Design an enzyme around this catalytic site. Structure first.
Site, PDB file in Angstrom:
ATOM      1  CB  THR A  42      -2.330   3.124  38.457  1.00 45.37           C
ATOM      2  OG1 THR A  42      -1.551   2.095  37.844  1.00 45.37           O
ATOM      3  CG2 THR A  42      -2.687   4.185  37.428  1.00 45.37           C
ATOM      4  CE1 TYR A  43       4.073   7.842  38.496  1.00 43.24           C
ATOM      5  CE2 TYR A  43       5.977   6.459  38.943  1.00 43.24           C
ATOM      6  CZ  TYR A  43       5.435   7.615  38.419  1.00 43.24           C
ATOM      7  OH  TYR A  43       6.256   8.549  37.822  1.00 43.24           O
ATOM      8  N   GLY A  52       1.261  -3.833  31.715  1.00 43.70           N
ATOM      9  CA  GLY A  52      -0.028  -4.180  32.264  1.00 43.70           C
ATOM     10  C   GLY A  52      -0.065  -4.081  33.773  1.00 43.70           C
ATOM     11  CB  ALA A  54       0.405   0.465  35.751  1.00 47.97           C
ATOM     12  CB  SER A  55      -3.831  -2.056  34.084  1.00 49.97           C
ATOM     13  OG  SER A  55      -3.297  -1.095  33.190  1.00 49.97           O
ATOM     14  CB  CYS A  76      -6.209   4.270  38.836  1.00 55.19           C
ATOM     15  SG  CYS A  76      -5.951   4.331  40.612  1.00 55.19           S
ATOM     16  CB  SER A  77      -9.834   7.346  35.233  1.00 57.62           C
ATOM     17  OG  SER A  77      -9.179   8.582  35.468  1.00 57.62           O
ATOM     18  CB  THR A  82      -6.604   2.117  27.921  1.00 56.42           C
ATOM     19  OG1 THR A  82      -6.191   1.149  26.944  1.00 56.42           O
ATOM     20  CG2 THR A  82      -5.731   1.988  29.160  1.00 56.42           C
ATOM     21  NE  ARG A  86      -5.974  -2.813  25.711  1.00 55.41           N
ATOM     22  CZ  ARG A  86      -4.769  -2.242  25.775  1.00 55.41           C
ATOM     23  NH1 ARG A  86      -4.235  -1.941  26.951  1.00 55.41           N
ATOM     24  NH2 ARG A  86      -4.102  -1.973  24.659  1.00 55.41           N
TER      25      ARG A  86
END
Length: 103
Positions: A42-43, A52, A54-55, A76-77, A82, A86
């Site tokens: 994830t970048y 957010g 990226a997530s 991408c953990s 986090t 959520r």
């Protein structure tokens, strides 16, 4: 309903999702002949570091696999650790979080 402010593009050649900026992207590969989607990397640029997005890239792979009844494993953990606590909506896809809540 699902109108994201970002326009996350799918590159089936790279097996990746690229945001409206294209500098932020999420990769994945379908493991076990295509039964488990390994979400890799994830970048996101400086503009949307902690926004957010990226997530959301990781979530985009979730949306893809979940709807197609596929399993997932996020490298991408950072997101998983986090973000998944959520929004625990993607547990049925992966382990649960970064690694825990699993064997």
């Amino acid at each position: 309903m699902a109108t994201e402010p970002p326009k996350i593009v799918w590159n089936e050649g790279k097996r990746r999702f690229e945001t409206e900026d294209h500098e932020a992207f999420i990769e994945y590969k379908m493991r076990n002949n295509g039964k488990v989607m390994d979400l890799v990397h994830t970048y996101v640029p400086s503009f949307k570091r902690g926004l957010g997005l990226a997530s959301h890239l990781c979530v985009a792979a979730f949306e893809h696999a979940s709807s197609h009844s596929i399993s997932i494993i996020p490298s991408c953990s950072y997101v998983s650790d986090t973000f998944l606590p959520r929004n625990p909506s993607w547990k049925p896809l992966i382990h649960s979080e970064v690694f825990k809540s699993s064997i």
